[PDB]
């Protein structure tokens, strides 16, 4: 997961100042499931 | 909003004012009274003498309820034609016409209502709500046979296809239906209404208007059908979402924090409903079973004792070296069932047929291993007993004992357990009302049988045959041998741990379709721990393995776990004996499930598509046969 | 990698094998052979390989072992603790 | 839907279409979300 | 909507590219900052030095979240009086006051937000959201023992009836509660608050206002209770909808298209978590069991052999005619456990007590049947062993072996598996450090025992004892005799298919209540196939049957399938042996469930109403007894 | 409800005029559960 | 009606019963009797009835049969294929 940029880079993956701080409040979520029952969708 | 409507009794109104609001009743809003209702349904009588005039309370109706009751109305509206035939509910219910819109304070409590002033709040009365629900229920009660017959008509022949298109002459379909429908079907009596209803339900059944000569799709559920339909190169969204939802429910029930805690966990919290267990006491090993005691085979002087039952009758039994008993203490409430079916217990001077066997309970301070005389038995009681019968067996000149179901319940609270230096023992052997000569009967006991134990409580747990008030789940990992697990009690913590881990196994299998030696998002957590551990410093020769080998090992370990959940507690398991690996897997499963975004495996998708195409071909073939055997004019 | 303690029947089997005069002992300089005396490293108890430095179950008879596997061993057990069993085995 | 042979729709006539499909499918309202907490 | 709000960089009225937008922050909307929060709950400190002053992000709140988080406060408001007693949350949270409405671009990415300008979008900060959730959770933590005691008070005596109406003197009820509630109950400490809470919760409890002398209903859940209440001659909508949803969930889990495919399906996709199996190797038959190999009898010249273990210790074994081994090739990773408890293995010149038994694995290039000399065994290794113990049995002058557990895990990866001619076998027999005289020991092996077999993977499937990469479900119908099914492997496809079809069985039983010889929408699909089949012209004599007979046959077939799901794979099954019928039923189940409309069985409804009336009568009798005791003043 | 007391200011639990009359229509309900799935919540 | 092939132990039982000469033969001309030679249609093997013209299982011994059941037959099996078993049975 290396990186290299030319002239300039708005983000540096291997640079300094980044933060890795897992927390219960932040968690991590996506869209796993939705409510699509036939009767309720109509 | 929700709750009840309030009126201000005084001029002062603050968010915490004392005693400022009072309930709103029907008198304040006359048009919510039953006399002013919209009697289009006809429930309220037209006779003046039959209508009461009393005050009624008011409640607030929420948008969720409004929408759901409207959908309930549409449920009825799907079958208007048969309703017209039966002359029921000529006018639609229209739930929106029973509500009155008011501006007032809304809330469950006065304190909440004091801060919540809303406008155009729908309110209703319990009697009107009951009337509406009753009308809907009456119509649904009416439509019962029509619903059943319509479903039968739809399911008689294939009407849906998993993918693609199928076709068949409508005249042929109608002829087949006329041939195969039952005699009492309402569809025969009312064809047109059935046709209209099926045209509403299914978008593939289209009727031509004879006047204008046009055909057209007439379904009303296209939006739902679109979500139910499998798009090209993708399974249905409904199916994917439902599978993910079920997996998350399984993990939530499995409860990762409790099953992976590194700290003591209370027994009532950790315990789950148990299952009975089977044993044979005679063939057990005392060094491996900690709840058995035995007289040493050196006393060599059998002695006779007398016991009394609850009714007060007296029995005789003999105790010799090698006799086995169960240490009743430290095993929690339990139920014992003994079966002697199939055994022989036949001796030259002893005939088992017609004899009685019973359970005996002893209470004494003297330890069992030192018993050499009748004075040392303490208090003894016969709890239950049964007579025996003998029948010929497969072997010639051999008679075996018929099946038996001798039962007993050990409840410690019924016993006086205040004295610490007291011992409780359970014995099963021959009993008789007459003295038994030791030479005649030489069997130490009748424990050569089948014993079934069932836990009598779900708040106590045992470890290695002794009860513990507190359990550490993570420390049970890799601490059981197969023989120890076999000899474990029915309420051992290991069984509960296995049962809880089974849900995690099912969730992983539902979420995963990976083949042999293929990495998975549910398998990489073990790989990370292995990679860190192999670099960690310790004692012994260090072996360095690349990421490919580590991933293969992790995949094999995950597959072994899915195949058999007991490996986590089995001693010396290859990879699953490490609490770090177990905890990493338990934590990683939850994140892996929660990070999904309406996805399915590529292998699963392609297999599903191929199967659906095959089913479509089968349906087309069947319809071709139907058309061939029912020719159209 | 951490380890767990053996079981009672396994210890009884170890005692029986020691007093009968057949115990598999692995020493660094000699290996699985017992012709030349040395400091024991791991021994087989009831089908389980146990590390003598911290009495942890490190392996089993079902897979071959050539060295002491990498593991977290507390190193809190001395030769004096188990010299007696070795003495009994060699005398037998 | 057999027998009873038309003024508006002739079940036994010509021109009708029976073409089951996956996109059209077939459904009604089998169930609804009516949990007491959400209903209030 | 949803996502995050975006704002135009620099100048406005110039947003034509995604690069002209940037995420909005609390700096742009000052009233979303912490300092401008309405601190009616007191969470934010009042000291200016303790309030952070930093920039924060913004997120968009959906209306579903708004409604649910608003309804969350109703749980608190149900118990406001005890909250006031504990001086907690004097002011209601009022979620809506925490939101700010703005006009902006809404989306997850700049490209999406470019075309989604909207007005009056509610936004919030994570800190404020966390504060609100924390307040709710603090109140819920506070109300715990109060809620427990309140539930105890409600459940101590019947307060709900399935149908109808009952009554009892409130004074007598209060006397009973005073006599029975526990001493430490908060109800004894706070009577009036409990009365108010229970009046709010239940509409059947009403308190008379002393000053005005009026009594009235104050329940706040009439709308919700109306759905739970069963109308006359109709079950509740709640129950009907829930049952239908559960049946649909079961079918979705059962996966009809997978279980009815006609094309090959990958083993990882088809497989499900397996279960252990039990066998007795000695009593099996070689023709049925394709994974067993025997040395042919009449070889009649036993030969000795020496094998070394992993440590290096040497052992002696004897191989004679009649010895059986397990073909370890093409059976997938698996674990074997062997138990010899209850056997004898006793001869004149052989006493089992103190002997040793073990598993020996042979790798060789010569078939096992041709083995006659020690040179033909190739490589051999003893992988595990255990010592035996004996104890006297029920039979006179006989002894039996105690319970044992010898384990071995076969994983093919560790083995080389590099040459196609190599043969792998597994054998269990007596092993001794000294040579065994062939006359003393005559048993070919120790296979006369109990074997437990458990898969170690979930990605492999075996058919008739051999692994296959893919399986076609449609060809497993009616292709298994009982002997083959009994002798099959634990990871067979037949067991997986049985388990999958089980779910369909419970779904059909849930949604059907038909009696004997009664047609059903779940039974007519078989009838259609039967009719078409009898109409088909083919080889054999044809006899015509009426539609009534066909319906009866279909109903009986469906009942048989429900009774025992395993009949679908059994050879020569009456009607279920046809893949056409199986596919028809599997496909028709989905349509039958999906076409329902809030309906229920007629017999079910009648039984439910009768049972509810009976329970109501019982409740009234109990209340009459309660009133007869504890007489009212 | 509420065992024994003697205050008799606003409501009298041990007094007369109160009615205990359970029925199906009134029932008894609280807030048992809510729809808080991550996908729907967003 | 679809049909399935018989199993190995059933075929073995067929061979055995042929070599002790008790195989039951069904012919349309003679029914289940075997006194008069006729072209076989079905045989009983391993407790299952098999149609010679397709070698498919068509029934079992639990239910009585009065004629050849209506089924899908490929008719790809010829008399030369299975004449040997009939010859052995008759000779026995």
Curated annotation (Swiss-Prot), chains A, F:
Q: Where is the lipid attached (N-myristoyl glycine)?
A: 2
Disulfide bridge partners, by residue number = none
Glycosylation sites noted in the Swiss-Prot or TrEMBL record = 3, 12
The protein's name = Outer capsid protein mu-1N
- Covered part of the full sequence, start to end and full length, is 1 to 42 of 708
Swiss-Prot record, chains C, G:
* Location relative to the cell: Virion; Host cytoplasm; Host nucleus
Chain segments annotated as coiled-coil in the UniProt record: none
Which chain segments does UniProt annotate as zinc-finger regions (CCHC-type)?
Answer: 51-73
Instruction: Specify the domain of life of the species encoding this protein.
Output: Viruses
Instruction: Tell me how the protein is altered or processed after translation.
Output: Cleaved during virus the endosomal proteolytic disassembly of the outer capsid.
Residue span of the signal peptide, if any?
Answer: none
State what this protein does: Stimulates translation by blocking the activation of the dsRNA-dependent protein kinase EIF2AK2/PKR, thereby inhibiting the host interferon response. Sigma3 prevents the activation of EIF2AK2 by competing with the kinase for dsRNA-binding. The viral outer shell polypeptides, of which sigma-3 is one, impose structural constraints that prevent elongation of nascent transcripts by the RNA-dependent RNA polymerase lambda-3.
How would you summarize the oligomeric state and partners of this protein? Answer: Heterohexamer of three sigma-3 and three Mu-1 proteins. The RNA-binding form is probably a homodimer.
Q: Which family does it belong to?
A: Belongs to the orthoreovirus sigma-3 protein family.
What is the protein's given name? Outer capsid protein sigma-3
UniProtKB/Swiss-Prot annotation, chain D:
Lipid attachment (N-myristoyl glycine) is at 2
> Where would I find glycosylation on this chain?
3, 10
Under which name does UniProt file this protein?
Outer capsid protein mu-1N
Q: Which organism is it from?
A: Reovirus type 3 (strain Dearing)
